[PDB]
Amino acid sequence: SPILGYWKIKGLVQPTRLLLEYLEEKYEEHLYERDEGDKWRNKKFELGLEFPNLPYYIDGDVKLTQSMAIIRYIADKHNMLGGCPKERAEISMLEGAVLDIRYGVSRIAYSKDFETLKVDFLSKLPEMLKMFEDRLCHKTYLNGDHVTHPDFMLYDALDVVLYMDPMCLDAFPKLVCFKKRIEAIPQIDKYLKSSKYIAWPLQGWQATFGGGDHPPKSDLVPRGSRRASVGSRMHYPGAFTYSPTPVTSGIGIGMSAMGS
């Protein structure tokens, strides 16, 4: 029996949590919360662990660690890494291209001036989110018709990003389909819906972003609300508060100029 260890947070072990789920895998995690920081420390080394750390994993003869060596290992056991050095290069490139955003936040997330480094991260994100959108043209998952580990990596990355700016995906309807498609997976459909699911925090309870015991909206910040309007409150079952509008006023119609 494998025992995945980590904190009771999304962190680095979330996507491996989504792969185990998706592969109907048997495992029992060793969750650690803020309180028991002393728990993991009087145990850390009594694990016969080569390179002590979190997330960890024990398959019996395999006392392994390192955040991403596990997810790949698990992805190895089932022939998911790659068949040839050619495509094994793709998965690692999708992997790494995902880690640029996953890590993008997890460097700026615990900083003092996250609020400022926040604007500059979202500035490169819409350029990164095109590399993944573009790649989905005629593709269920990043690598086509089958699922790969960097899929729960993109899902996780996409999930998190949607907390910084819940608008940074609109221009990307193919990435939103992608997310909605992973969630539409039974094994992933009955995990995000179980107790196992760890919906918070995003990083660590000590993270300026994705931190805390609760996920309220509280802070965050808009901008385009300092100008005119494009809202409407007519049959728009929203959720946030970005009042939509109508497509035109009926049909094409052209011409026109407006007035004020």
From Swiss-Prot:
Q: Where does substrate bind?
A: 110
Biological process (GO), any one:
glutathione metabolic process
Instruction: Indicate which residues the UniProt annotation says bind glutathione.
Output: 6-7, 40-44, 53-54, 66-67
Question: What Pfam families does this protein map onto?
Answer: GST_C_3, GST_N
Q: Which InterPro entries match?
A: Glutathione-S-Trfase_C-like, Glutathione-S-Trfase_C_sf, Glutathione_S-Trfase, Glutathione_S-Trfase_N, GST_C, GST_superfamily, Thioredoxin-like_sf
Task: Give the top-level enzyme category.
Answer: transferase
Residue ranges of the GST N-terminal domain? 1-82
PANTHER family for the chain:
GLUTATHIONE S-TRANSFERASE, GLUTATHIONE TRANSFERASE
Assembly information from the UniProt record: Homodimer.
- Look up the further comments and give them: There are at least two isoenzymes of GST in S.japonicum.
Q: What is this protein called?
A: Glutathione S-transferase class-mu 26 kDa isozyme
